[PDB]
Amino acid sequence: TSASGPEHEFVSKFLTLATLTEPKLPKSYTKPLKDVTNLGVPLPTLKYKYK
Amino acid sequence: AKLAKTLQRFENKIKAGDYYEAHQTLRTIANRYVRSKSYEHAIELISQGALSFLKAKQGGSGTDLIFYLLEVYDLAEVKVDDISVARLVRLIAELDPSEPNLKDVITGMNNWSIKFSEYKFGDPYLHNTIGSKLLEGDFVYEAERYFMLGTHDSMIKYVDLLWDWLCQVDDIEDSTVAEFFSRLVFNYLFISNISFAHESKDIFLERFIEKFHPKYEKIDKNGYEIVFFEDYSDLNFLQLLLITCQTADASYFLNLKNHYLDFSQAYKSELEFLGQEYFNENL
Amino acid sequence: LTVEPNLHSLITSTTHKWIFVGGKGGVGKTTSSCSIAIQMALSQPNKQFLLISTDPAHNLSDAFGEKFGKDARKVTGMNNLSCMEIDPSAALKDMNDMASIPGIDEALSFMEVMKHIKRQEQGEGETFDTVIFDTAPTGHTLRFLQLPNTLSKLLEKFNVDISGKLNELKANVETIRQQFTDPDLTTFVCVCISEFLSLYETERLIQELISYDMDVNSIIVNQLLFAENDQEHNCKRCQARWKMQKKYLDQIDELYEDFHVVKMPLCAGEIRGLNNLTKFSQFLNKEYNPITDGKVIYELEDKE
Amino acid sequence: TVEPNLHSLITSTTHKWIFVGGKGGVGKTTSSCSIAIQMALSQPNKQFLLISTDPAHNLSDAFGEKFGKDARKVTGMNNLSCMEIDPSAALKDMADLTGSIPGIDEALSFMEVMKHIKRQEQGEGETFDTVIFDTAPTGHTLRFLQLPNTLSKLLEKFGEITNKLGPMLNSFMGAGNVDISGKLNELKANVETIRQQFTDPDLTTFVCVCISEFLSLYETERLIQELISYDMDVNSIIVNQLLFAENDQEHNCKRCQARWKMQKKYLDQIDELYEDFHVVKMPLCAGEIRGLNNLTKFSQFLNKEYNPITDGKVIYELED
Ligand SMILES: [Zn+2]
DSSP states (O other), X not given: OGGGHHHHHHHHHHHHHHHTSOOSXXXXXXXXXXXXXXXXXXXXXXXXXOO | OHHHHHHHHHHHHHHTTOHHHHHHHHHHHXXXXXXXXXXXXXXXXXXXXXXXXXXXXXXXXXXXXXXXXXXXXXXXXXXXXXXXXXXXXXXXXXXXXXXXXXXXXXXXXXXXXXXXXXXXXXXXXXXXXXXHHHHHTTOHHHHHHHHHTSOHHHHHHHHHHHHHHHHHOSSOOSHHHHHHHHHHHHHHHHTTBHXXXXXXXXXXXXXXXXXXXXXXXXXXXXXXXXXXXXXXXHHHHHHHHHHHHHHTOHHHHHHHHHHOHHHHHHTHHHHHHHIIIIIXXXX | OOOOSSSHHHHTOSSXXXXXXXXXXXXXXXXXXXXXXXXXXXXXXXXXXXXXXOOTTOHHHHHHTSOOOSSOEEOTTOSSEEEEEOOHHHHHHHHHHTOOOTTHHHHHHHHHHHHHXXXXXXXXXXXXXXXXXXXXXXXXXXXXXXXXXXXXXXXXXXXXXXXXXXXXXXXXXXXXXXXHTOTTTEEEEEXXXXXXXXXXXXXXXXXXXXXXXXXXXXXXXXXXXXXXXXXXXXXXXXXXXXXXXXXXHHHHHHHTTTSEEEEEEOOSSOOOSHHHXXXXXXXXXXXXXXXXXXXXXXXXXXXX | OOOSSSHHHHTXXXXXXXXXXXXXXXXXXXXXXXXXXXXHHHOTTSOEEEEEOOTTOHHHHXXXXXXXXXXXXXXXXXXXXXXXXXXXXXXXXXXXXXXXXXXXXXXXXXXXXXXXXXXXXXXXXXXXXXXXXXXXXSSOTTGGGGHXXXXXXXXXXXXXXXXXXXXXXXXXXXXXXXXXXXXXXXXXXXXXXXXXXXXXXXXXXXXXXXXXXXXXXXXXXXXXXXXXXXXXXOOEEEEEEEOOGGGOTTTOOHHHHHHHHHHHHHHHHHHHHTTTSEEEEEEOOSSOOOSHHXXXXXXXXXXXXXXXXXXXXXXXXXXX
């Protein structure tokens, strides 16, 4: 189970580094939809049909 | 007092199944109001008329009258507000999801809401209802977009369709879950709704855990949580990616990408955009 | 409730205080105004009715064969109908001599006529329950109904300071409009003839009235031949004319399905005096039937 | 002594364009047909074209033969041809500024009709000496006559603004800079050419058609004022559908007698308002007149006034 130790180490450390200060934009931040001016990028089509 | 009467004469003709006559009568009357610039009267008459055609399963007539309504909305410069949108919501309810013109009708409604509000992409509350209709017609990708641009309730509905869709997939995998999950993270990051990004992630990952029992441990630091998966590196990347975007710190973004070289390639376009939006990476 | 080709419901209505009659161009307007007034007075003996003309041609005096004017006079032979003939342009012009915005002229003109009516009720102790307004054939006399809206927008955008005057005038008109837009208090009966130009002008009038939020669902169609039915089929000229009239009657029936479309016969001798006017007027209340009622019409012509 | 007929017009050798117009079922098409026939009969050495732009195909109905986009001789005439077109349909078969600027739509439409005429002459269909234009009942088809003035004032405003600037910004802004302006000036020049002839009273006139009734009289005064504002010559009025009831009680019951009374009232008004016009008073015929034979018999009263005492037999012979 702990064979994924390498990636666990990285996640652990990275999370600590990032959360050392309050992230600039807080979790509850929402850009007012009135101000939203573009979509970002099309995501790929899924191979699976929806039914 | 006269308006109530002509709408009764009309709904008599509709109970009788005289749909051509009903449509004819209403059009004469509506036209006269439109011609005399009596727009409130036309709006009430037309909308009511459209409603009873739809209730009577006369899709063609009802849809035509919805377009007529939108024409008058545009003519009378009807601004997006609660009453304006409610007329359309009440109509969307009666629309058969199979109507051949569904997408046109919805685009008509949305386009009015763009022109007469300050939303580039249209009123969110309207989007919530439109989304649901589209999904009834199996127009999944269109529903996704409208929900994305919707309300809190739309976010819940968005998670539900995606979750239902993942469950429909016969051959589950490691990369499969991420194909669906990544859509919430990316889309809500694209519109900078961090709150919906977090909340959708939470709902989705909890359901994933409760159904598939993956191996995981919750890592918690300063009030933030990463669900560390043993077999879903994709999922780790996507969670850390979100928090990275919140910080707007290029070095964290770089660290994150350097660790997950494959995901950096896989999400190349998405990451270039996030780098621009959150970072400052314009070329 | 299916819409009867007569004015019965209006004639016996107890709620209407203002009945307007209008129509452009030799369409039997004055006869129609007079006939509506007579029918209402006869059907409602307990109420007092005023028939007022703002035509300068003194048309009501001509129609009844008595001299009417600025002072209300009972028509001889009636206990409950009075007539007035005024000229509001002339009344304004004398007032103005004694020294940009649409609807003003018309507002001040119509306030004058209201003033005169109210004054006439005061000085004779008889207040009128309903006024039948025979409107002037030319001009847009009710255009002032749009004023409160035009002027309210003007005030937002905003020597003698006229703002107070403007607001008072807005308030004055809004008071009128409250009653003129109430379908139970006020309605407009259109008068026309079964011909292309008249039908076109009637559609215009109706649209004008709808834009004022004035109730309109009555159309009197005059001068109908009913030529197939009289007998003495002699007159193929009349038969050909009837054919054309039927064409436009069909158009009216389809355009104004929800209106009271009342179809009135042509009478050879133009109808004058109380007696002839009441006999003819009855067909506003109960439809003329050419088969059965022809002899009534011929009596009038026969009498000359 | 301005004569109550169209004799001087009918025998005129100078007119190339005769317009006929009137709103509201006033006998317009019969009047156009009658004018064309009278001119053709009185001037056998000339070739005449009667053209309708009414989509109802009224001339085909009036003569009882099928006419269309291609000029056809009316059967029984050596000298008269008929055309029926639709300029809206011709234009569609052939943009914001057409809506923005008044007269443009009408200019391009009318240039199309003239183009079609000229082509029809050219492909061995004879050159026509005079065209009788049965105008469409609706719209302001000659509004283009105002265009050269509207457009000239627009080019001055264009000349004031553009020549303010540059030439850095002027040359950047101008790809095809002269081009759109070239097109406007060409169109202005095209219309001014037409106007030169349409405002020439010896080349062009408009005959109004009406009935002796209040609304028609009112619309006719409006029409006349419209034509004066285009500088179009107008001094002919045909008044149709007159009963002259006092002169045949046999055909004229008291209903008709009463109607005639009313008609006389408006005839008197016309006589006083249009003292200097040729006011031609035409009799009602009960049966609407169709075919060359009936149309030529009736049409003669445009040239020499109908007299109800003397000519009544001619009219009552068409009725049966
Ligand atoms: Zn007759």
